[PDB]
């Protein structure tokens, strides 16, 4: 489904556990996702549903919650 | 003309599409990578971050320059000379973490 | 003493720093590539963008 | 040889290269000849060693 194929992209992008990526775990903290991670890991959920984003629509998303939120 | 710019628009949209997903597995494989050196191997001696300014080219020969060198070195350890051959494989590269 | 230390201090020295060297170098030249692509993919977002 | 790529024979040739630093030690000429071909642009320098 939509909402695990989420925390796979975020994990394997990331490394981080799929506990750890909850809907609230917010990236660059939770997840440590610095600013080439964050970039890398929008591209690859860009890949996941083979779908775009606006520069500023995907900059604005910044935690596991308003990313399912915009792919959904 | 537009049309006709539209043309060059897809192909570069096919272009960037492709450049994407390689990032994308690139990214993939670079973090098993790094997790393998997070245990206490970046700091100070794996990544050096001084040597970010060259290419492939001269960092892949010095690497086969040094490792001519390793292997003399490591005759004697035939496990860690087993490391160091196997993970001369540079399709492999973790392997030369592990070493 | 000296001839123990010095023997140890030498083998050290040199398999630290050939191993370093090797190991470091497709370290860094997976990174830089990696950070290049990334670039490459930046620039033909924003041109297919524009 | 024609059968792989350039990035794969250059490997090799600094991979055999290195080991013929480590060797050349021991005669003046041959060490020579390599500390004047290593130099990429100069392959008849490498032919000549
Ligand atoms: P990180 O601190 O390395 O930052 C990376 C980045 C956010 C600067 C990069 O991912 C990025 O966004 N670059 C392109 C910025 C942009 O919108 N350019 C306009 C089109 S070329």
Redesign the pocket.
Known sequence: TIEERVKKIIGEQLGVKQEEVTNNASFVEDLGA???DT?ELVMALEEEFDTEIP?EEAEKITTVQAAIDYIN | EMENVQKKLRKLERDYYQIREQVVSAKAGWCAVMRMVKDNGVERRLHRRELAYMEGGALRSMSDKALGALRLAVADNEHLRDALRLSEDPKRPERKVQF | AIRVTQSDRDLFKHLITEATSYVSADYMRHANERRTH?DEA??L???L?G
Do not use: K, N, Q
Request: glycine content about 8%; cysteine-free; hydrophobic content about 50%.
């Open positions: 610095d600013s080439l970039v520069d | 990334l930046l620039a977002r924003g041109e963008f």
